[PDB]
Design a protein around this ligand. Sequence first.
Ligand SMILES: CC(C)=CCC/C(C)=C/COP(=O)(O)OP(=O)(O)O
Ligand SMILES: [Mg+2]
Length: 302
Amino acid sequence: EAADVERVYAAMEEAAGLLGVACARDKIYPLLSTFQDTLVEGGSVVVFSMASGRHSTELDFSISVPTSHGDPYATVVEKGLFPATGHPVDDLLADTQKHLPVSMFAIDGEVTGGFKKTYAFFPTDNMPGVAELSAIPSMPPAVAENAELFARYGLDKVQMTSMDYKKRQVNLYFSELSAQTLEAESVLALVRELGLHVPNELGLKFCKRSFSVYPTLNWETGKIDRLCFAVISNDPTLVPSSDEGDIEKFHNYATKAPYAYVGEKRTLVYGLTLSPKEEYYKLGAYYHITDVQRGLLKAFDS
Ligand SMILES: CC(C)=CCC/C(C)=C/COP(=O)(O)OP(=O)(O)O
Ligand SMILES: [Mg+2]
């Protein structure tokens, strides 16, 4: 439906407008048209994410794609929207769906850069572990090489994975996080073992409220590139930053981002990313939600 396409793109321009970013129509429209059938409201999930620091001038968008549509990456490459990288990341999404049960896909891009990643969601009642994922042929070796470290901190079940074709990286979104996993002492030992920025009192408090945690890995080495803690809430003032700018800019976005489910508050997902020499924050404001998001809010934002 050309209608849903225009609408989704307009909302995307709105979100970008809030951060002073311009959408590259030539890179976005073709992508939205290709999966236009998935833009239907109801069972679709769409997110527009902002970030701080060196990411403050970009705006990401995520769109859920039903598995029935087939490998979303093969589609973008076949249509000529993106050039295969020639690396294992090209087959990872396909191999993941082949070896494990995938409940749904998702495409991700940046308003000025275009397409850059896909996601593979797993059934909540049938989530794979570190061992099941590390056995995927195209999966980065780093996953298996860090298996002992993951198990030591209670990172077992994975609710989904994401593949970044431009940076050739993979994220493992751990779920069912225990309390001792998110304890201050545990989080500190973990970051130190990975050589990432040490979170302060404020950051640690945010890590404790996390419902999801995801490390980023690559095919070059067995070293984790960064680690992210995600919190989901309806509260627009949670950005874990002490900078006046961030507090103001994030809260503004959280209260003005577009959303197609009037009648409820905006679902928000905040992120605290720790890299070797710094930390940055991100915030995704959902444009479209489903009962999954509602279920999560009841469980982690009560
Ligand atoms: C359709 C749905 C429900 C999408 C959810 C996407 C999500 C939780 C992304 C987290 O990664 P990121 O956006 O913070 O960045 P990166 O992958 O680059 O680390
Ligand atoms: Mg992003």
